[PDB]
Amino acid sequence: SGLEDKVSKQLESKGIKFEYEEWKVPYVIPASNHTYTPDFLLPNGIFVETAGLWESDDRKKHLLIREQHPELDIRIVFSSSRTKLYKGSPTSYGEFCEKHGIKFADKLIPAEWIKEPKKEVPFDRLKRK
Amino acid sequence: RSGLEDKVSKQLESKGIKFEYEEWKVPYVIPASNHTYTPDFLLPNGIFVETAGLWESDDRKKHLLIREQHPELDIRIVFSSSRTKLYKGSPTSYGEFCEKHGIKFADKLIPAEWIKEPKKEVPFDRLKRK
DNA sequence: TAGCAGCCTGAGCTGCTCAACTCAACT
DNA sequence: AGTTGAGTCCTTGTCAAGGGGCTGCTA
Ligand SMILES: [Ca+2]
Ligand SMILES: [Ca+2]
Ligand SMILES: [Ca+2]
Ligand SMILES: [Ca+2]
Asked: How does the annotation summarize its subunit structure (chain B)?
């Protein structure tokens, strides 16, 4: 890479023996707080996230939120649950969801969903606006 | 406002149902995690040199965390251009940031004084090879 | 084998300015 | 004020694919 090519040459220009990318330095990123805003709250108590591109971070999000707010029912309406997780993955968003317990549907919110009976939502645990 | 969002909004109202759109936020934590950083160069002085072109938010935090977590390590930056601003129309240059934080830096080339400096013990004890 | 971490300034043009961008929230 | 979070499938080839692309742990 540009500077890497140049500074390597600039050092050898002075006879000095450098070490290039040999040693790795480990370190921690401390825990942090974040907030997720699901797209839709039906009067059923059902949260609906509309998702087009659905990447690694986002998956973890839904997984963390689920561990962290076991009472919340958050379900995904995919643009296309056929999409693959990443370049030539065998796995579809679909495959991933079912394997993880995530209720999902495609392009539209199904009737059964809306037709479901009311559940208490803990606004206690959430933040408005 | 966005493709499916436009569509599923209309699809609900098509049925009379009153939905709530983006009103409630759900807080959550990301737990601590382990990572590793590989500085570009280790001089025989014991000086670590990172060559940096574009140097963004994450990277700054990296260098700041590593410094908190490995007080013995001397890691300094040779910028492609320390004139670069942190982000769209920031008043701050990578340079400004470095000095305000204690980060020793230079531009395009490793200065002589740097290499000319005397030897320091490096704790390879705390590091990982390869 | 899968899955994800950890990397990475040159064009291109007005010595700066662009690789997306736009509101919200945090500090 | 200044910095960072959080959120955003619709365009380019045979539905599908698909984001930059490579190397290289870690289970
Ligand atoms: Ca959203
Ligand atoms: Ca969404
Ligand atoms: Ca490097
Ligand atoms: Ca570098």
From this structure: Homodimer.
